Scaffold this active site. Sequence first.
Site, mmCIF file in Angstrom:
data_model
loop_
_atom_site.group_PDB
_atom_site.id
_atom_site.type_symbol
_atom_site.label_atom_id
_atom_site.label_comp_id
_atom_site.label_asym_id
_atom_site.label_seq_id
_atom_site.Cartn_x
_atom_site.Cartn_y
_atom_site.Cartn_z
ATOM 1 N N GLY C 29 50.460 45.756 51.756
ATOM 2 C CA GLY C 29 49.297 44.869 52.210
ATOM 3 C C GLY C 29 48.106 44.721 51.295
ATOM 4 N N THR C 30 47.058 44.296 51.605
ATOM 5 C CA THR C 30 45.803 43.936 50.956
ATOM 6 C C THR C 30 44.929 45.198 51.460
ATOM 7 O OG1 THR C 30 45.246 42.425 52.431
ATOM 8 C CG2 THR C 30 45.893 41.831 50.411
ATOM 9 N N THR C 31 43.952 45.539 50.409
ATOM 10 C CA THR C 31 42.999 46.663 50.722
ATOM 11 C C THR C 31 42.233 46.466 51.827
ATOM 12 O OG1 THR C 31 42.990 47.070 48.245
ATOM 13 C CG2 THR C 31 41.326 48.337 49.729
#
Lengths: 71, 196, 243, 241, 244, 250, 226
Positions: C29-31
């Site tokens: 996933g994204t930060t």
Amino acid sequence: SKMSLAPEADLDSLIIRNDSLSGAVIAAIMQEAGLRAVRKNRYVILQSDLEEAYATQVKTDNTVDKFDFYK
Amino acid sequence: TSIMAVTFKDGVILGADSRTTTGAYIANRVTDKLTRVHDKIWCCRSGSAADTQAIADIVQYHLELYTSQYGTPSTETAASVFKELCYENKDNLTAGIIVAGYDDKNKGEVYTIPLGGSVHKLPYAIAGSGSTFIYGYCDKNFRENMSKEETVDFIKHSLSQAIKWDGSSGGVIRMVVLTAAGVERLIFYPDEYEQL
Amino acid sequence: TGYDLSNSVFSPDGRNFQVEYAVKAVENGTTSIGIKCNDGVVFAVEKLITSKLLVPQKNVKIQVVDRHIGCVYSGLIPDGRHLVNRGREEAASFKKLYKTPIPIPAFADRLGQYVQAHTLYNSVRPFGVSTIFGGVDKNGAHLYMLEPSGSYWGYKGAATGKGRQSAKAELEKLVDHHPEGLSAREAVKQAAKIIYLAHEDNKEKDFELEISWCSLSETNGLHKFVKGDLLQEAIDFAQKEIN
Amino acid sequence: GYDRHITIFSPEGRLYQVEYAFKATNQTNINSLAVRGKDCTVVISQKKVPDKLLDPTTVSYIFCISRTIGMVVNGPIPDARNAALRAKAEAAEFRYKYGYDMPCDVLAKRMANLSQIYTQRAYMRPLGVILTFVSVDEELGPSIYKTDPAGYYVGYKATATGPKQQEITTNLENHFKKSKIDHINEESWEKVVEFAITHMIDALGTEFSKNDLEVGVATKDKFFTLSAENIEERLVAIAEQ
Amino acid sequence: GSRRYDSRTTIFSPEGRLYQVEYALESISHAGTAIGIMASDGIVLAAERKVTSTLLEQDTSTEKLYKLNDKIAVAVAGLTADAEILINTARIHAQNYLKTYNEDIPVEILVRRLSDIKQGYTQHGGLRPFGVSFIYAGYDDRYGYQLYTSNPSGNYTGWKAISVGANTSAAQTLLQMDYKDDMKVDDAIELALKTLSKTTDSSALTYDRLEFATIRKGANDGEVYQKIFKPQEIKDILVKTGIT
Amino acid sequence: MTDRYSFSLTTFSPSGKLGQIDYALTAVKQGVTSLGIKATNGVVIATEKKSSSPLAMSETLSKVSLLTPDIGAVYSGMGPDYRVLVDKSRKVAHTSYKRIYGEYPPTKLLVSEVAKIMQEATQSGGVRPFGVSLLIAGHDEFNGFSLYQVDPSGSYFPWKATAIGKGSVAAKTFLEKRWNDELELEDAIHIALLTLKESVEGEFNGDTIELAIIGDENPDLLGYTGIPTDKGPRFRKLTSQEINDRLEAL
Amino acid sequence: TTIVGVKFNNGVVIAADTRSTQGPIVADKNCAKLHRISPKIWCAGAGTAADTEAVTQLIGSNIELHSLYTSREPRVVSALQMLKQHLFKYQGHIGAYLIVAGVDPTGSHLFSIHAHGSTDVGYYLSLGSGSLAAMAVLESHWKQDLTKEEAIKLASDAIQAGIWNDLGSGSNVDVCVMEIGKDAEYLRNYLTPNVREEKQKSYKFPRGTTAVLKESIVNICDIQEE
């Protein structure tokens, strides 16, 4: 009988604990009690050393170690 | 039965009489109407003897569980559990309950729950049978933030009159003083309170 | 051999492989960061702009729960959007029964049981999401992070997604310089600085920064979005330093 | 193949899957020690907070079930919370249906029976925590019962659990070998804590700051954990001896 | 999911057979032997136990003979555990019929009812079939004495003399040469013991390892008395018929 | 969330024998020795304590238990599996026989309700067999004393004296030769200890050998006087002092 | 019916009459009215006699089981809290009135529990038709702190007065004394007021007075041997 022991120490205390042991494990226990006596600097093997050395180099727990609920 | 709770400067004081009738016959002349549902939230019970006792054991159970998980309940909170057992089952139960609590963040509070099933924050409440006969006596005499000596005398004169005119009230006046101090019971005998 | 195929089975070691696998699905996933300020919390999430067709500022990945619990997650986006949805029942239900807004250590507990339950049967897949959620109640601010295993802890800064290395290293320096507990008004500008630094291992596809805060003293303990000027100032602050 | 995933016997005659649960226990590196006082019970356990980022207060292994019952958990923390939440519900329900407080024994026996149903159904997995309940029961005095995933439980004069539990067992035994009584004797509950910490410094070799320990004490009718200030007082008492 | 661990105990084989019902037949061939003989005026049920040590008290023990009401006894061969379950469902269905028609249950109903219970588990459910085979000896006025055997398929058929358990084949061939239609209850007893004497694994045949019960019409007023013999009547009848 | 195991995990191996009842009968042969002897005026049952550690108390553990005031039980095999089966033994005794007929079930009767619990641990879906064998000693009014063994299969048997556990092969050989028809409950106690002394290698203190009789009734344990119709409990577990008496009687 | 419960220092004494009625006709001249819940917890029942019999047996089993499961002697308040919940669930159909007395490790207790689930404490209690006639005697002589010989006399007097002055009570007084740390004493037929005075005559008829139409014999034994 070869080794120098206090008359306080007694072999009868030992024999009951383990229900299995062989002539070579016994040899090691006496070495260990007599090696440990050198750290304390005691001529004799006192019953404190004898007891400590008994509990090490025995084990025999692999089967009821944490599986004691089979009785 | 005639109950009341009067908040005051340090916390809140509850008082009730000890009579339980089944018609003309008096069953118990010595019965505790002030029940602990937690160690800082007490309630007074009036109405049908059974109906309210069933609620009081079930509230005691809901608030014990509340403490073990979420931390000390507030007086606000305890009032809302009564609200949910009274309103949902209002066709079966007849329950007139005063809930009086002491927080250490808000001092004494009083919530009253009449037969319907609504909460009401009041600075002093009266309920039960003998309440009718003192609505006027209390409204003259209640000032806010009185000293603990004066407030105990104010609750005794009240229920004194509630006992003298009502036929369902009588016996000893018990009291629970519910403060920062803790829980301090008083009791007032029939010889003492019939002169005052 | 056959111990990896199924859930709620243990290997001879003592591990649930399905649960170990789910952490690898969180890892893509994204930060996403969460900064506990003195007075509340600041959530901030890198949202990748995949293409020129995706509409600007319209795909919020910050979901609110009640009026005072922000939830931001990374991992499987539908699967997070279900774990919050179940979490809106647990909160609305507590509020019905005890007529007080649900406290944050208790909400952490409800979610915990729900995710922990989904590692107990062969019949349900473990959640593939790490959550950061917190807010402000009458006992102060809290911040939590929910592993897909079912553990959660307190935190003073948290991270998940691909940029979890650089972020968690940057949140250490943020608690070093400011051991008093930095201000909420300032921490908006510091959260921005931690997304732009953790976006240098991902500088391929530009992004759009989302920030939200919940502070006792700024917005009255109600979870809002940062929008308008204070957000356009945050972009400026982080962008000027990393030049 | 499908005799070692689910809970059926193997051809040999052993529930493999249950046996695999006990190896899941020692996957947190917590050690604990628990001794019976003369009118109280004391249980210490190490509390390792790995990262600087974690808030040190939330990490805990000591759970308040009731006023009467404390509970210290050894093992993975998701299953901790799952067994603690089920414990609390049974503690409340008991009080409601029988009208007094749940004794220690009765809470221990209710967990062993839920644990048994979990090794007999096929789709359930046994929970990987070992639970130890301390209390000052009113009938039997100080008590400790330790429950486990198999569903076996027994009373204890004192007990330890963890990776280095063997070292800690030897000390707890050596003490009851010399004094020849079942329980540490010292009326005050403050000095049972001092004794407790001494045996952990020996058994693990580790010197303890005030943050590395988390202490729980059951007296009459209240169970608390000691504040971070109070654990610093105890460690000045070991240094001054 | 659950499919991996699934045995599937209800599928057909590649040849149109049921493996799992076949195997139930196999476990019945290890258990003790049971025989029934139909005379004109009664029925003999005689079963050999699988246990025989002397510490065991075989004297009050009954694990082979059960009464279902006061006219139908069964013998068991298979898992003795399993068999007690079907016997209480039979005892109850035998009684329901007496409740609703005030007339003792026909033998044909009570046998056909148990069979379909067994059939039931191989049709659906995924449970393992039952591991039991019954010999029903019963009396009804419609046909007189009747004998019926059912197995874990659920197929039952009547018989004149039948045997289930160890060496079913060997026991049937000895009976076939000797049996006659004019037999009385005295003659049948003597053929039953002798046939068990030739098949028993141990050369010696003792009174203690045999169970034995008859149904005779020599109870007055046109009635039938079921007796499960005491150990002292068996002992005397083993010396009378000259087996020892 | 769902249970989707409804299918038997006990199937017939292709040469008969249900695979899972064979195995469970092996975990019953690993257990600790336990034995029982029937006399003409009582029954004795005895077993050896097993201790996890020297730290663990052992008095807290009950290895002999009461089912009703006239029927006691003792097991060999797995500890967890016996605990849940003793509680399901008392409920089904009260609910299908105490309330309905008044008196407490006969001993024949009670064994059959417990055997149905075992049986339905293989017929039913999702489960495996209990890993225990029971001995059930008891006393009913119309058949005297009796002793039973209920195996994980479900089969039960009356015995005059038997043993189960790891020293079961040695113990039953000795009891075969020593048992007689005339026996006192006092004499049997002497046989029960003498055998179980050979089978326990560990400490033989009277603390750690739990023995219990289903002898005769105790006017003292009844708890109330003035009803000459009621009688005391026939079960009585002996204290540690009393068992130390019979050891020095060896 | 008359039922009293009188707490004293070291125990509690609970006593009742023995007449059981079926409208105006006495059903049984002497009958059991004290029911045993467990070896230390006795209770007595007024109201509908089928309801108290059935409820005491149901709370008997559930507290006997509970006793074996925890391995403790049962506390009195267990018996009270299981009754409260079970009498409420029916909304007051079951007309059971009990005085549940008992001793235990906490001390002695004495409760009263009505048909709606309402409960009270007391140091003297009464139930039944002639309950008011018992309350007058308690009020007159009850003082705090009594000895066992004294309390037993006060308990039997009250039932003594309920027999003469209420019609529903008659025949024997049964007492039941439970002391702390002792075996419960059930003292059956402790006061006999009056036995049936003799008849003036006997009434044995000479054999052959009844007229008999036919005779037969009914075999009850099982179908006769083979």
